[PDB]
Structures are given as C-alpha cells and as structure tokens.
Amino acid sequence: MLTYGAPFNFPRWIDEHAHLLKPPVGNRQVWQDSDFIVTVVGGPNHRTDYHDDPLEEFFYQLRGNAYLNLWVDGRRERADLKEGDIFLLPPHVRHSPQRPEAGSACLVIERQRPAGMLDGFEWYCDACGHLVHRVEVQLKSIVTDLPPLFESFYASEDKRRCPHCGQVHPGRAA
Ligand SMILES: [Cu+2]
Ligand SMILES: [Fe+2]
C-alpha cells in the first residue's frame, strides 16, 4: 500500500503549517515512521550547538535565507543557504544552522539512524575554540530525545566550562 499516502502540493502544505514553522516549534516532519526523515524548518532560530550527524543531510532552501556555521579543516567556516540553494553535507561535518528570517522554509532530508550509530551534539569555546562539551545520543525521536540534551547543557556551568581556558560558554544565546 502507499504507507505514506498520496502525492500532495508542497507549497500549500508549507502555507498550512506556517504556524508551526516559527518559535517555539520551528520545524515539522512531513512523514512519520519512514526511513527518509523529511523536515521543513522555518525561522527565526539561532543556536550554539554543533551537530555531528553520522549520515549525510540534504538541504534545499525553498524560501528565505539561512546559513550553516561549520568546522571544515579545523577552521570556522560558514556555508550560506540562500533562497533557491541546495547542498549536501557529508557525514560528521560539524554544523550549527542559523535561520534568521521569519517565513523562511528549508527542506532537510536525513536518514533514520540504525541501532548503534550515534549522533553527537557539541559546543565550542567562543574565546579559544576548544571543544567544551559533547553528548552522543541514539536519536530515535527529535522531539523527546533532543531538547532535554540542550536544556541540560544550558542549566550547567560545569558542562559549559571550557577545559582549555576555563571560560563558561554562554549557554542558549551566543
Ligand atoms: Cu544536523
Ligand atoms: Fe576556551
């Protein structure tokens, strides 16, 4: 059977879910329980964590502009997602997506991670650049598995404390 239902008009679906593509929800997964995890991410949203995904992430910035803060070759770099851009991020490249614009919309496609293949989430020192804290997670569901991880980082000066220079990372807003 068509487990995932019939085709349907995507711009209309994005319009209809506009209330969810802004704070505090910010994103909406299109189909549930599929191998391909297909999400539309709105804005505005800024964040300070970097994602270490053990699989690739595809992006197609449909509306508005965004950008990814990256580590590439041990160096801080930015990949702009201008409206209309597509991009494929290889495994493990660290990214912290920034989505400044309201009414923006990006198609993001990932794969379910198999048992034993973990995601990392991590934060780096604004002053010296050293890794501050990393947590590895078996990501089964974004909505229950991820916000407590971030919240536990923001609530602890210990987790936020740079082991190189001792500066305490700011937590939620940079
Ligand atoms: Cu990611
Ligand atoms: Fe530091």
Curated annotation (Swiss-Prot):
Binding site for Fe cation 2: 125, 128, 162, 165
Disulfide bonds: none
EC number per UniProt: 1.13.11.6
Binding-site residues, O2: 47
Residues annotated as binding substrate: 57, 99, 110
Described purpose of this protein according to its UniProt entry: Catalyzes the oxidative ring opening of 3-hydroxyanthranilate to 2-amino-3-carboxymuconate semialdehyde, which spontaneously cyclizes to quinolinate.
Protein name: 3-hydroxyanthranilate 3,4-dioxygenase
